[PDB]
Design a protein around this ligand. Structure first.
Ligand SMILES: *[C@@H]1O[C@H](CO)[C@@H](O[C@@H]2O[C@H](CO)[C@@H](O)[C@H](O)[C@H]2NC(C)=O)[C@H](O)[C@H]1NC(C)=O
Ligand SMILES: *[C@@H]1O[C@H](CO)[C@@H](O[C@@H]2O[C@H](CO)[C@@H](O)[C@H](O)[C@H]2NC(C)=O)[C@H](O)[C@H]1NC(C)=O
Ligand SMILES: CO[C@H]1O[C@H](CO)[C@H](O)[C@H](O)[C@H]1O
Ligand SMILES: CO[C@H]1O[C@H](CO)[C@H](O)[C@H](O)[C@H]1O
Ligand SMILES: [Ca+2]
Ligand SMILES: [Ca+2]
Ligand SMILES: [Mn+2]
Ligand SMILES: [Mn+2]
Lengths: 236, 236
């Protein structure tokens, strides 16, 4: 009925977090989603994803009940330069098991252009593509990079962000709270999302974090995750 | 289309804030909702309310649109003693114009027993009455002191709390974020509320803060508001 996991820090070679592409783990006990320099020389078009080994069940076929979950994590985004404009963003996401990876850059390594991929994600977009509003912003992506609801927030460069994503099965209310404590700012964005109806092909989904850097040179930024807890609660 | 007000501090004798009962304004530029001692001797059964002079419009009869508002405020609750247990709580609330005052203590000076008063309020209950869950908790009161949704939170004694109450007319999603920055804690509670259906007798409502202390000696705490901004935005 309940699935949980908590990372107060990130230990190297954990049998719990399954890393992909540029994503590695710093000796610091930090999860680094995208490299800023590989082999001494600066790079771009970097993409890093990190999933949780076990599939989380979001709804029951027999019972017909949808899970309620809450996940929290701290991240640190540093944007070194002012020109060219930094990119692309960081994002929490849920996809069905054994599902293709998303494109780089703008799609945050989660979504693909042809309407094929089935995914959900809460994004922290730092770059304004053709479909984006002023950046940076918080976005609720339901099967598309185009957020169904967004919120502009002022990023604290190199500061520690505290995120909370809470979803209540009964009210189908997805909520996102972004707060920068070291400065006293809080951002809250919430919209209605019908999980059962949006992931009808798998009662199970993989949960993970992802980030990506620009397509040009220097259109990059750091994407570090400091901690990350999760917990679903499926009744019935 | 838009009504706003902001108090980065509280000036004495402002023509924008109709104070009621025990509620006064300290010289430090703080709004003190309930006195802990009057003239030198300790007291209880204290009740303080503070409204905003102008009525805020929440919905339009003709167009049919409901307003969307967001209000933030910082408060400081200090509970001096451990026995007897402290009471009662602090709360943001909306009532129709020219409406009666609620009862002391448990009703937070907002609601009355006989189902007569029409009101809404986000409460920060510090005392567990017969209808309450473990305290302290955040509660969403829709026409009753019995919250339709609640959330237990650990209070930081004498610390500054940052509250955010955001309501989105289109999704009818009421959200409450309570965060104690000095410690790194965030609490988020959200439930669905149909403002237009819950205040059908007045397109207008008075907005205000309120607090109350126990019914017994020493079952008291301080209720200070440091800042408080609001903003509705009714389309059409
Ligand atoms: C946020 O991320 C930046 C980038 O990783 C951190 O800055 C780096 O600090 C390390 C020391 O641990 C240096 O070796 C790097 O050269 C720094 N990078 C840059 C671009 O300056 C920063 O320390 C992080 N902030 C926190 C609080 O963890
Ligand atoms: C909350 O308000 C209370 C009441 O003013 C503050 O507590 C006082 O703290 C001062 C020290 O600055 C003492 O001199 C008083 O004796 C305290 N009063 C009581 C009743 O204990 C408290 O510091 C405020 N909290 C914050 C974060 O400012
Ligand atoms: C013009 O857009 C392209 O380059 C920027 C960097 O400048 C971002 O990487 C974006 O996602 C990509 O599509
Ligand atoms: C037994 O309850 C009564 O006393 C406590 C204090 O002990 C509170 O004031 C409460 O609101 C009131 O109804
Ligand atoms: Ca983007
Ligand atoms: Ca109570
Ligand atoms: Mn976006
Ligand atoms: Mn209560």
């Amino acid at each position: 009925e309940t699935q949980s996991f908590n990372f107060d820090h990130f230990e190297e070679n954990s049998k719990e977090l399954n890393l992909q592409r540029q994503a590695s783990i710093k000796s610091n006990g930090v999860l680094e989603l995208t490299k800023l320099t590989k082999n001494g020389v600066p790079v771009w078009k970097s993409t890093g994803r990190a999933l949780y080994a076990e599939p989380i069940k979001i709804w029951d076929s027999t019972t017909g009940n949808v899970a309620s979950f809450e996940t929290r994590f701290s991240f640190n985004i540093t944007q070194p330069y002012a020109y060219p404009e930094p990119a692309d963003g960081l994002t929490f996401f849920m996809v069905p098991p054994n599902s293709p990876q998303g494109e780089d850059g703008g799609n945050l390594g989660v979504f693909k252009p042809p309407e094929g991929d089935n995914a959900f994600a809460v994004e922290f977009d730092t770059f304004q593509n053709t479909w984006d509003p002023q950046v940076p912003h918080i976005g609720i992506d339901v099967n598309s990079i185009v957020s169904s609801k967004t919120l502009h927030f002022q990023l604290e460069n190199g500061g520690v962000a505290n995120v909370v994503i809470k979803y209540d099965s009964p009210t189908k209310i997805l909520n996102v709270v972004l707060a920068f404590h070291s400065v006293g700012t809080v951002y809250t964005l919430s919209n209605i999302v019908d999980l059962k109806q949006e992931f009808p092909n798998s009662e199970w989904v993989n949960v993970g974090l992802s980030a990506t850097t620009g397509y040009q040179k220097n259109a990059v930024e750091t994407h570090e995750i400091i901690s990350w807890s999760f917990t679903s609660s499926l009744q019935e």
